[PDB]
Amino acid sequence: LGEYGQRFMWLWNKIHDPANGYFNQDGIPYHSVETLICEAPDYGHLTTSEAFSYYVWLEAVYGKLTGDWSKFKTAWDTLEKYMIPSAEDQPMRSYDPNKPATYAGEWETPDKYPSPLEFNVPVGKDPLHNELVSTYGSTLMYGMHWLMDVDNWYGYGKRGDGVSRASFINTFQRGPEESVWETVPHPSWEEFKWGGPNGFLDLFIKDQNYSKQWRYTDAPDADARAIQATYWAKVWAKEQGKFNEISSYVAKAAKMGDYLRYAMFDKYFKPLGCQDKNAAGGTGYDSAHYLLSWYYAWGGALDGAWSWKIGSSHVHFGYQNPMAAWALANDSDMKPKSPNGASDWAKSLKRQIEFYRWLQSAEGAIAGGATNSWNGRYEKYPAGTATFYGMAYEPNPVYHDPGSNTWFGFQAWSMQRVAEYYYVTGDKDAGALLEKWVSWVKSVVKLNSDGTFAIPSTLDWSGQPDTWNGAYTGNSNLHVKVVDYGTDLGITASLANALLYYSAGTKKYGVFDEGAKNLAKELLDRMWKLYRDEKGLSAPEKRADYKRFFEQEVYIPAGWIGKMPNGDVIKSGVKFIDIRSKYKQDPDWPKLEAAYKSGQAPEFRYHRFWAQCDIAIANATYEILFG
């Protein structure tokens, strides 16, 4: 084991050291060691399917370096036990594939919700349902719900029991301007035990009456990451003569991939390009965009009177995963058991690669994405809108303030997967896409003379690509700008990881790009030199946005009154902290308050679980490819 594999082991040891507190008492990883953090989850001991996917990934690499596949198996075991809803959590009955859901608009601001159901709006057909049921013999949807309250901090428990750990919750529901600060956290299982008279439902969806019900939301990027990780575990185990220990677990990734196809469809199964909410619904695959959209979701009445499934009309390049798609399409170990699963993934692979290329800026960074539902209401695109198989270009799909593609992180996370795919296949389009993007990366990363480094933090965009017709035009009017710089260590490591796979590819298939290998190695070494600490690695970050703890009003309709499980009153006027008063018991609360009352930006050195994973994985990757 070389220097870099040893680097992985040390961080792995930190991560798995019970005293460091990366995991709860059940072995579920938290979002971060530190509880006082707000960014996508709003509390550090929540967890995400993202974290679970990174957990699978870390252990897959451990198996590679180690020959020991127990960690990978227990990772998967935990994932399936807690993060995928069980038969009891999702008792789906009376699903209609010809009427998968009923439509509701999306609106520009949270104060426009609850969104009214519109019962006359045509909805298309779900062509997956029957095939899946036939294949698996079950109505259970095999995907991770995205958000978990690991230690029941909020207090909803499981299935409304108020007590259990590993509690399913949700937050984001109120359109493109509901920031992490502007949500009302609510249980996935709704029995009206909390909130108002109709639980939390009528903050979000307006109906004539309300039924007790469950609903879950998949984050397609996380499920695909897990599949991606399992692909590598599969080839690594095979290399060692250990495939058989893992076989039933590659089967988990295969089945997860089978259900992940829901991410490939328009929200309400409307035809691509329809631009009319009153247009008739699609009849099958005419509503598939074949990309990994922002979510899929599914729900059911507790009494079993009905159920529903939706995809998403909004697609971000940051979610795509050609490695997982390739694996599911082409690798005989990974192919889903359904008749059309592998075929659908072959279509998605090609469509994804076209999407990346279509979105590539004049400089080389990848632009945001596209939607099949302009303003989330199937409206007519403005004149001159660039399109991709009938979908409209959006610089910032889904979230507009701040825009979802203003975060540099997606460049790394997503291009890392393309880089893997190119390494595996030599795909010329991926190679060309990566070469331009690497060129851009090399031009914006700062390797300072004094041994420090900075990576882009925030990006800004202007123009649009040329409408897609199968060939990259150079997109000379689509521009990126680096707004500012930071030392996000998770993203730094991810970026190193992508650069290394690309480099290994060019050696295997073209002219070895040594410069890319060296850029990555520098990032990994300068980081190792500078940022190690007791629990792993961390870099200081000021979080001036944390004034929103105290200042951010949460929209609540006039006259609507409810309560959180801890007794916090939910009504018009409440602040972020008013519906989360347990935050006041946080060890770092005095620090936050002192910073705030003194008008100063509090400063943190966080250990985010995914970030520590990316660091560990990136170092191991150098060993694996250049060892």
Ligand X SMILES: OC[C@H]1O[C@@H](O[C@H]2[C@H](O)[C@@H](O)[C@H](O[C@H]3[C@H](O)[C@@H](O)[C@H](O)O[C@@H]3CO)O[C@@H]2CO)[C@H](O)[C@@H](O)[C@@H]1O
Does the footprint of ligand X cover residue 608 (CB under 6 A)? yes
Binding segment for ligand X among 150-158, 304-312, 485-493, 552-560 (CB under 6 A)?
485-493
Tracing tokens 């294949």 back to the chain, one arrives at 135
- DSSP for 296-320, written as a single string: EEEEEETTSS-EEEE--SEEEGGG-
Is 182 annotated in a binding site? The answer is yes
Catalytic residue flag (residue 50): yes
Please check whether residue 27 is in contact with residue 15, taking contact to mean a CB–CB distance below 8 angstroms. no
Q: Read off φ and ψ for residue 250, nearest 5 degrees.
A: -70, -30
- Interaction mask 362-401, ligand X, x per CB under 6 A: ----------------------------------------
The amino acid sitting at 44 is G
Answer positive or negative: Cα dihedral of 322, 342, 316, 385: positive
- Interaction mask 23-62, ligand X, x per CB under 6 A: ----------------xx-------x-x------------
The amino acid sitting at 386 is A
- Interaction mask 321-360, ligand X, x per CB under 6 A: ----------------------------------------
Does the footprint of ligand X cover residue 602 (CB under 6 A)? no
Answer positive or negative: Cα dihedral of 581, 587, 592, 595: positive
CB of 44 to ligand X, least distance (A): 10
CB of 297 to ligand X, least distance (A): 18
Tokens of 500: 């290394």
Is 245 annotated in a binding site? The answer is no
Q: Read off φ and ψ for residue 537, nearest 5 degrees.
A: -130, 145
| Active-site residue identified among 34, 50, 178, 427 | 50
Closest by CA position to 555, among listed 141, 127, 280, 177: 177
Please check whether residue 14 is in contact with residue 536, taking contact to mean a CB–CB distance below 8 angstroms. yes
Decide whether 40 or 117 has the Cβ nearer to ligand X.
40
Catalytic residue flag (residue 221): yes
User: Among residue numbers 429 through 458, which ones bind ligand X (CB under 6 A)?
Assistant: 457
Count of chain residues binding ligand X (CB under 6 A): 14
Is 177 annotated in a binding site? The answer is yes
Tracing tokens 């936050």 back to the chain, one arrives at 592
Decide whether 417 or 608 has the Cβ nearer to ligand X.
608
The amino acid sitting at 293 is S
Decide whether 232 or 407 has the Cβ nearer to ligand X.
407
Distance CA 538, CA 527 (A): 9
Decide whether 66 or 312 has the Cβ nearer to ligand X.
312
Binding segment for ligand X among 121-129, 306-314, 464-472, 481-489 (CB under 6 A)?
481-489
Binding segment for ligand X among 129-137, 252-260, 487-495, 554-562 (CB under 6 A)?
487-495
Q: Read off φ and ψ for residue 503, nearest 5 degrees.
A: -55, -50
- DSSP for 456-501, written as a single string: EEEEEEES-PPPPSSS----TT-EEEEEEEE--HHHHHHHHHHHHH
Distance CA 579, CA 412 (A): 35
Helix/strand/coil (H/E/C) assignment for every residue in 326-384: HHHHHCCCCCCCCCCHHHHHHHHHHHHHHHHHHHECCCCCECCEEECCECCCCECCCCC
Decide whether 48 or 320 has the Cβ nearer to ligand X.
48
Distance CA 540, CA 536 (A): 13
Does the footprint of ligand X cover residue 487 (CB under 6 A)? yes
CB of 29 to ligand X, least distance (A): 12
Decide whether 111 or 522 has the Cβ nearer to ligand X.
522
Does the footprint of ligand X cover residue 409 (CB under 6 A)? yes
CB of 589 to ligand X, least distance (A): 20
Query: Binding site: which residues?
Result: 177, 182, 401
Q: Which residues are catalytic?
A: 50, 221
Q: What does the binding site for ligand X look like in residue numbers (CB under 6 A)?
A: 39-40, 48, 50, 407, 409, 457, 486-488, 490, 541, 608, 611
Query: Binding site for Ca(2+): which residues?
Result: 177, 182, 401
